[PDB]
Structure 1
């Protein structure tokens, strides 16, 4: 349990400060977007330490989000299909897109994804709410057998 929020203007939009509705293991602490911090020192020492942490994470996290958004918008992803009769038979799952992201060398969190499955016939691309400000399209090249 904690009162700390982190890096979100969505999810019952509020200020970038310390605030949390006290209810067990709810989404207020189920997400990596709200850090469980020790409230025993969250008065003056953890206070200014968390202020510094908030400013630092603010800066570095939007920096990395701009970097990854540029990477996504400048790179297109590739699969290979295995159908029969040549008629549309396959689709696109999020597991394989996460695996291709892993191929580049980062473990992207699922919290930027809202879809579950995509149609894999022909060219297909979707722009998702990756982050509060950075938006990019997951350009993927897919063709049948």
Structure 2
């Protein structure tokens, strides 16, 4: 229940400081990526510790983003669909790609995928806005059968 953003910038840029007015659940507690800590420390004495924490989170975010981009662009995803004699009858949902990511040893959470559901067969490439500056692009092949 803090008053400071936590490592994810909201709508059109607000700086990293004590500015998030608390409606209670509007977008602050709506996003599960926010801080849960006492308030007496989080006025000025814990500000430097929070800056160090934000730097650590930024660097690990960059490292993990690069790792995921590398392992995604080296290992493209594969599924299969039932075809209407050349027309795509099967359906593909983001649940399937989330499951594949989770099985491949790199869990992707439920709070970064905001794209529409995919409908179609053949090779697809989608640039997923998981990150603002270091986003990734995924390639998927669905076998027609």
- TM-score with structure 2 length normalisation? 0.86
SS at match of 1:137: strand
Please identify, of 108-117 and 53-62, the stretch whose mean Cα deviation from structure 2 is larger: 108-117
More strand by share: 2
Deviations 1:52-101 (A, max 9, x none): 21121122112211221222222200112234555321121000000000
Higher helix share: 1
Any conservation in 1 of the 2:81–2:89 contact (CA below 8 Å)?
no
Displacement after TM superposition at 1:111 (Å): 2.8
- CA shift in 2, pair 1:55/1:87, >3 Å: closer
Aligned pairs, number: 145
Query: Within 5 A, what are the aligned runs for 1:29-40?
Result: 29-40=29-40
CA offsets 1:7-51 (integer angstroms, 9 cap, x no match): 234423111233212101121222133223321221344223212
Q: What stretches of structure 1 move > 6 A for 4+ residues in a row?
A: none
Question: For residue 79 of structure 1, what is the aligned residue in structure 2?
Answer: 79
* RMSD, matched Cα: 2.0
Higher alpha-carbon deviation: 86-95 or 44-53: 44-53
Indicate conservation of the 8 Å contact 1:4/1:36, yes or no: no
Task: Give the gaps of 5 or more residues in structure 2.
Answer: none
> Is the Cα contact below 8 Å between 1:126 and 1:139 reproduced in 2?
yes
SS at match of 1:134: coil
The answer for unaligned runs of 5 or more in structure 1 is: none
Q: Structure 1 12/33 Cα, relative in aligned 2: closer, same or farther at 3 Å?
A: farther
Q: Which deviates more, 80-89 or 112-121?
A: 80-89
What is the alpha-carbon distance in structure 2 between the residues aligned to residue 35 and residue 98 of structure 1? 25
1:101 aligned onto 2:118: no
